[PDB]
Design a protein around this ligand. Sequence first.
Ligand code: MG
Ligand code: MG
Ligand code: MG
Ligand code: MG
Ligand code: MG
Ligand code: MG
Ligand code: MG
Ligand code: MG
Ligand code: MG
Ligand code: MG
Ligand code: MG
Ligand code: MG
Ligand code: MG
Ligand code: MG
Ligand code: MG
Ligand code: MG
Ligand code: MG
Ligand code: MG
Ligand code: MG
Ligand code: MG
Ligand code: MG
Ligand code: MG
Ligand code: MG
Ligand code: MG
Ligand code: MG
Ligand code: MG
Ligand code: MG
Ligand code: MG
Ligand code: MG
Ligand code: MG
Ligand code: MG
Ligand code: MG
Ligand code: MG
Ligand code: MG
Ligand code: MG
Ligand code: MG
Ligand code: MG
Ligand code: MG
Ligand code: MG
Ligand code: MG
Ligand code: MG
Ligand code: MG
Ligand code: MG
Ligand code: MG
Ligand code: MG
Ligand code: MG
Ligand code: MG
Ligand code: MG
Ligand code: MG
Ligand code: MG
Ligand code: MG
Ligand code: MG
Lengths: 52, 137, 122, 117, 204, 71
Amino acid sequence: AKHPVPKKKTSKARRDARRSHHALTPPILVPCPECKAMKPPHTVCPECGYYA
Amino acid sequence: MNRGALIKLVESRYVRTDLPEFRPGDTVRVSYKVKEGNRTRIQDFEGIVIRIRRNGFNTTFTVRKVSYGVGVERIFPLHSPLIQKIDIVQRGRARRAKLYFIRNLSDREIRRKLRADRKRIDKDRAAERAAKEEVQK
Amino acid sequence: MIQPQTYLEVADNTGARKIMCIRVLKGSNAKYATVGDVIVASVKEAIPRGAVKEGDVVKAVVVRTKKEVKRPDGSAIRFDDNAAVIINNQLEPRGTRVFGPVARELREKGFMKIVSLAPEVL
Amino acid sequence: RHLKSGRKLNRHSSHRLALYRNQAKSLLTHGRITTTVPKAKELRGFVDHLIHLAKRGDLHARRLVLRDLQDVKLVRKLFDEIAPRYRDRQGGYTRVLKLAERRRGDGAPLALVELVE
Amino acid sequence: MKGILGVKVGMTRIFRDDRAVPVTVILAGPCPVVQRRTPEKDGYTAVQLGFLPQNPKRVNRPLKGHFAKAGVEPVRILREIRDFNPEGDTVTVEIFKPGERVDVTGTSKGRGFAGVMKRWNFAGGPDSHGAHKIHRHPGSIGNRKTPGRVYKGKKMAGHYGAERVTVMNLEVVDVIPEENLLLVKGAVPGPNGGLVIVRETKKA
Amino acid sequence: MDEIRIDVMRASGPGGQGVNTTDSAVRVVHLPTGIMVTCQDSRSQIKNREKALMILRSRLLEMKRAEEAER
RNA sequence: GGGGAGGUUUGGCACCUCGAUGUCGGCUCGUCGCAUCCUGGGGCUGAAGAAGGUCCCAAGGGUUGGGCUGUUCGCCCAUUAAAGCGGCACGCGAGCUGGGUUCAGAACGUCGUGAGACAGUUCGGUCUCUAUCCGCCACGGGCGCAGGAGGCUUGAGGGGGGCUCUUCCUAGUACGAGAGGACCGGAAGGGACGCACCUCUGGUUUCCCAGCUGUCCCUCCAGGGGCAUAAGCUGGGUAGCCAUGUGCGGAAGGGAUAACCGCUGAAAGCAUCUAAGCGGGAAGCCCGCCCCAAGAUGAGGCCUCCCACGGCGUCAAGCCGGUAAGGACCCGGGAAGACUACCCGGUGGAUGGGCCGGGGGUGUAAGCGCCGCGAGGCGUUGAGCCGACCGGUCCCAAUCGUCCGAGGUCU
RNA sequence: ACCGGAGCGCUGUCUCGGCGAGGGACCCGGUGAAAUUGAACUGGCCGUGAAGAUGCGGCCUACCCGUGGCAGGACGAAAAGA
RNA sequence: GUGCAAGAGCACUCAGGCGCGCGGGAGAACCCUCGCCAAGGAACUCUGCAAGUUGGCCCCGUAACUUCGGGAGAAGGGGUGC
RNA sequence: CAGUGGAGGCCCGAACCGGUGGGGGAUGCAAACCCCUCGGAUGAGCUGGGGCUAGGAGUGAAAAGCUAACCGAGCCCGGAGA
Ligand SMILES: [Mg+2]
Ligand SMILES: [Mg+2]
Ligand SMILES: [Mg+2]
Ligand SMILES: [Mg+2]
Ligand SMILES: [Mg+2]
Ligand SMILES: [Mg+2]
Ligand SMILES: [Mg+2]
Ligand SMILES: [Mg+2]
Ligand SMILES: [Mg+2]
Ligand SMILES: [Mg+2]
Ligand SMILES: [Mg+2]
Ligand SMILES: [Mg+2]
Ligand SMILES: [Mg+2]
Ligand SMILES: [Mg+2]
Ligand SMILES: [Mg+2]
Ligand SMILES: [Mg+2]
Ligand SMILES: [Mg+2]
Ligand SMILES: [Mg+2]
Ligand SMILES: [Mg+2]
Ligand SMILES: [Mg+2]
Ligand SMILES: [Mg+2]
Ligand SMILES: [Mg+2]
Ligand SMILES: [Mg+2]
Ligand SMILES: [Mg+2]
Ligand SMILES: [Mg+2]
Ligand SMILES: [Mg+2]
Ligand SMILES: [Mg+2]
Ligand SMILES: [Mg+2]
Ligand SMILES: [Mg+2]
Ligand SMILES: [Mg+2]
Ligand SMILES: [Mg+2]
Ligand SMILES: [Mg+2]
Ligand SMILES: [Mg+2]
Ligand SMILES: [Mg+2]
Ligand SMILES: [Mg+2]
Ligand SMILES: [Mg+2]
Ligand SMILES: [Mg+2]
Ligand SMILES: [Mg+2]
Ligand SMILES: [Mg+2]
Ligand SMILES: [Mg+2]
Ligand SMILES: [Mg+2]
Ligand SMILES: [Mg+2]
Ligand SMILES: [Mg+2]
Ligand SMILES: [Mg+2]
Ligand SMILES: [Mg+2]
Ligand SMILES: [Mg+2]
Ligand SMILES: [Mg+2]
Ligand SMILES: [Mg+2]
Ligand SMILES: [Mg+2]
Ligand SMILES: [Mg+2]
Ligand SMILES: [Mg+2]
Ligand SMILES: [Mg+2]
């Protein structure tokens, strides 16, 4: 409301561009020694267990 | 490369062991290789130790004394080559490391505030005169 | 470190007792002044009918400082108060016997007239 | 910038302090305690000290651990069962394990502080 | 044009003949020549100097070939030295005689996104009478409608330090070849562990 | 006129946005005697310069008439 | 008495802006002009020397602290090499201040019958957390660089810096009756500033150690904890981070050149530095030193490593899985860091954590013995405790694994 | 708790800043506004134009998209100028 | 309730009731709130604005002036635990 | 003079009442708030409940202040599509 104010309604094109790097990234997983289930690296897991 | 300490310690061959012990709260006078107009001499400095800045080598220490109404303080490097002869003169109850509180009350109260560590007194006088007799015979 | 408004004690018998510095005589724009440096300074108080009176603007030279002075031989030294001696433009003390110790630095400055009178040339 | 120093911690002081004491207390009680990944890592070095300290014997070392752990019975349990089990096992009296779960709402990564065995 | 790689090991003070002197302790280990580039093969004279030893397994890179091209133990780091073709296969602290002054280039400490007052040593603003908002601010930055922009290279808060910096004319104090150490006139860029190069100064 | 410097500057007093920009404060100074006078009691800068001088003159003139009458 | 320049002042028009272009000073941050205050170079002098006057060349850098007032301005104080004048909405309030001016209250003087009024004075009086675009300072992502990849570099171009004083030697000589007092060259110390560092000096060090009051508590005595801040208070403090602390820079040297001195020399038999030509000569111009830099799409260079189509495209240009060198994800962490990026390490391991030795900080723990009616003291004791700094050791944790990624156009 | 002058004491008001504490800023997960807004593909200088240019002219410069931060301009917002 | 001269003040604590309806990390500039500092001590600045110095109690002592009550807590100093 | 006695728009200082100076807040926690500091504190004291006074009128230790969050003449309907 005060001093900081947008001068112009940002164009739909320019807006979408900003969200360029906005895209997510898929998580990383790996097959465990127990089940074939995909555990996240350096971790245990439910319905699988672990050792030591 | 795992020798970071020894490396700095190597250069530290400028060391000296001729220097006796001394902890805060005890008077001590040092001989200093002071250069006059151009020659060289030894200015003596009688005074109590206030601080000993331990830090491996280059471990400094300070001494404060009354001098014609003015209290002067001199900080000396321990392994300083210019230090001719540091001589002990009287030791007292430390009870504290850095004792600046003397600056505030330099008076007969400082005398009764800094007792006399009879423990070190004995060990000193005893080990001095006793070790003498052993070195003699 | 002595600067503009700094009060200084008087070591000599010039009759003055205390003088606030007025300006440090050195570079075009010096900031501080340790032992051995000369300064302009106003006399802020003095003994009755002394050689120099209050308000008498004077040149003087530091002789003792609260801030310790570093020695090239690693050594150091520090006094209990900041004091100085009033000087002539001939750079000689307006007074005689100057009690209270002084630094060795005064020697490398050509004020041997001071160190001679000085009892404790520490 | 000035992280040249040791570790990191949240909350003020008396809080974070009592925090370590709190986690160590319950950790010496149950042995296996799940908590945030960071908290665990810091709780790691704190507990091990109490353990190796209890590995000693003299009552001085006892009262020394009494400062953090307040329950006299819990410390009594440390000098009896806990300490001997880790005899000769100089250092590493505990273990930290990353969990795959994620606390709902805050998405905090979970982990485990297991008393090695 | 002498030159040699090394790492800042730390610093304390020694005693010259009777006066104290702060001095930094550099470590110029044996640096094997890796490639003497002549103007023929390239377009300028220089020499690649290796340094610390390395786990041969870590250097599985084609660097293995680059090391074999001169037949040398796999080093960790290697940099050139302009206009400098020495001798033998390795440079040493023997290159520098006590008394000679040297230029030491290094990587200053990283102070990150430092404030403007921290960076260019600005003045900030009043601490009492003025608003409690601009205590450490740069205040103004420009004029009015003219120019209406900002002078490029204007001093502003940002990432600072952690960059190539070169102190100069540091006199080489006592150099001990018995351990590959090298003392200097104290102040030297980089932390205790950084890679620093030492070259010949330009007094004349 | 060669031993008289005319200084100008912002006025001192009311006037609004004008008194701020539009200076119109004039101060003169007879160099050889150091003596000086100044006026600002009028919106116009020149009107002050005129008067300020007419006074500078008369004030100086009164000194000669007195110094001479002193001899 | 005459002719211009400049666009800093006052003034004259009233052309954009009254559905708003915040107005004086101060602060902060500056940049640019030269008609130059200083330093550097030079002609003339009523220039002996020194010092000075005046004019010319010259922005590279420099241009102090304080008293009075809201002041700009100005006077004064101490000093200085000098304490330059101006542009930039009289730079700068979406950066600050709000003492002034310019609302409401009050008063004096003063004008008015009055309500009221004042380039007259006086006391008081709300300064608006969120930056979309350009601009600037920093840091990433994506592609491009006609093959993929790792390591090291070239420097077109751009940036930073650039100041100066004083004492001594040559020499108390040249000059001068005397007082004074040299250029030239060399040495040394200093001020302000800038870059880097923690050895020393000295700050902080938020629980590193110790002591202390009141209170509640474990457990009655000791002993210990919580709270009294977001440390309860006090005394002291490594590492780190720091200036008051240590180190180093301005240049030297090369080249062209400014005013200016000079050589040769006409037109114009003489003469002249000039029109042909040539030499000297500024803190300034180019290079030289430090930093950035191949998005230098004009994508550079050197060293080194991998290399075949295996199935579709008749052709031109492509598509798809496995791949190689090599890269990425994940993890332990880092004087690197907002996030990201950069860097080290990942069992073939000392990366962090733990433990131990050391440095360092604190300053004689606990418990028991003894002296004293007691508060206490003494011994055991430099004990006990003990973050960051230096190093050792696989007890714990960096287990295992996965994806990407040339098969390289034409003459 | 009125306005002015001076002095003593004591101090980060200042020379001149430094370090540290915590609550926000920054990263991740959850929820999720506002004023404003002709349309935008929104560079610098010198001129230029109703006289202060991203948009006209000439010239120089500049791969595409962001994140953090500063406020010079968009005669920035706000209130149909007091 | 205990201690501080007393007190409904302050500190901790009974009985009782709460940890305030976004959290997790990181430990940049910058802002809020806060602690500390060498040497100097108002040079800051429109003004010591802000901050800090002093502080409770007991005893000694206390000027000009005065409407004789005051000025007085003037100022200045000593004592304070067990 | 001593003792007694316990007056005061007296003093110090919480509750309570009030806002001096600074800081924060400024699409706030809040259409007047928070923190530090500061005035009165047996008196023209503060406070609850019940009552009366209103628009050119009230009330006012007097500012043109207040009279239901903007009072140099309240608010709502109407003349009124002035
Ligand atoms: Mg003598
Ligand atoms: Mg670490
Ligand atoms: Mg530890
Ligand atoms: Mg408890
Ligand atoms: Mg504000
Ligand atoms: Mg502006
Ligand atoms: Mg008016
Ligand atoms: Mg008039
Ligand atoms: Mg007209
Ligand atoms: Mg308009
Ligand atoms: Mg001459
Ligand atoms: Mg001349
Ligand atoms: Mg010129
Ligand atoms: Mg004033
Ligand atoms: Mg200017
Ligand atoms: Mg202005
Ligand atoms: Mg403002
Ligand atoms: Mg005023
Ligand atoms: Mg006027
Ligand atoms: Mg006023
Ligand atoms: Mg006013
Ligand atoms: Mg752009
Ligand atoms: Mg270039
Ligand atoms: Mg470019
Ligand atoms: Mg007890
Ligand atoms: Mg306690
Ligand atoms: Mg409690
Ligand atoms: Mg300290
Ligand atoms: Mg500095
Ligand atoms: Mg030159
Ligand atoms: Mg490159
Ligand atoms: Mg004992
Ligand atoms: Mg007094
Ligand atoms: Mg764009
Ligand atoms: Mg154009
Ligand atoms: Mg974001
Ligand atoms: Mg209370
Ligand atoms: Mg201080
Ligand atoms: Mg001033
Ligand atoms: Mg106090
Ligand atoms: Mg007292
Ligand atoms: Mg009363
Ligand atoms: Mg009163
Ligand atoms: Mg009221
Ligand atoms: Mg405010
Ligand atoms: Mg107070
Ligand atoms: Mg009405
Ligand atoms: Mg009333
Ligand atoms: Mg009306
Ligand atoms: Mg109507
Ligand atoms: Mg109508
Ligand atoms: Mg009608």
